[PDB]
């Protein structure tokens, strides 16, 4: 898998989720207790990328959250959690 996190300084944009992966934690893939709202960086929310899914990239229909365990361990305090595809290009998958 050629997938990393963005991990840039996140700003005031809010992450979205498509309807497949809707109630998951963007970090640990859990469904128990969504706690903290996800912020993304300004580059990952731009132009045609505005409003896409943080996890997969599809059309977003709800807000993305950190679960309670990640909030307790302070995993919301790293960079932008958008998934980046290194094996392909920008307008690719």
């Amino acid at each position: 898998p050629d997938l990393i996190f963005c991990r840039k300084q996140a700003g005031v944009a809010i992450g979205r989720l498509c309807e497949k992966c809707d109630g998951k934690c963007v970090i640990c893939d859990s469904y128990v207790r969504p706690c903290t709202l996800v912020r993304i960086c300004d580059e990952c929310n731009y132009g045609s990328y505005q409003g896409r899914c943080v996890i997969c990239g599809g059309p977003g229909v709800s807000d993305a959250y950190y679960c309670k365990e990640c909030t307790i361990q302070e995993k919301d305090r790293d960079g932008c959690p958008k998934i980046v595809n290194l094996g392909s290009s920008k307008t690719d998958l």
């Binding site: 365990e69 307790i72 361990q73 302070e74």
Partner: protein, 145 residues
């Protein structure tokens, strides 16, 4: 937090499972320990979780990716539940071991404990003495009023 009355009942099963030939047993048992320790935090089950930490630790010398990834997550949850002091006390053994493998593993564990709760470690570092050339004692903390 409802699971705080039921850690003692489950500890023997987990002790058997964390000492087992099957790798999936140990991986899943470390997942259990992680979720227990994060679920009870600020309720006082440090005795039970210290007992379980004794059985989690021998698995840090594991070459398998998913197993070592489960063990590290259990250790990070036990950091939150138990305190960085006990984790630092377990970790100070092998930071300067002669064996480069032991040093690798222990510095991984220490770097986790350091990135999480860097400021709490100021109170838990041990006393290291001055040699001929360098001063390593912290004197302000020895001041008495």
């Amino acid at each position: 937090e409802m699971g705080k009355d039921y850690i003692y009942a489950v500890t023997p099963l987990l002790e058997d499972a964390l000492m087992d030939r099957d790798l999936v047993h140990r991986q899943t048992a470390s997942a259990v320990v992680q979720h227990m320790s994060l679920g009870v935090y600020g309720f006082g089950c440090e005795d039970s979780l210290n007992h379980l930490l004794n059985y989690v630790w021998p698995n840090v010398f594991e070459t398998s990716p998913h197993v070592i990834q489960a063990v590290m997550g259990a250790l990070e949850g036990l950091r939150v539940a138990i305190g960085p002091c006990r984790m630092l006390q377990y970790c100070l053994q092998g930071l300067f071991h002669p064996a480069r493998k032991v040093r690798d593993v222990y510095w991984k564990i220490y770097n986790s404990i350091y990135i999480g709760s860097q400021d709490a470690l100021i109170a838990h570092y041990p006393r290291i003495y001055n040699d001929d050339k360098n001063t390593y004692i912290r004197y302000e903390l020895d001041y008495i009023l």
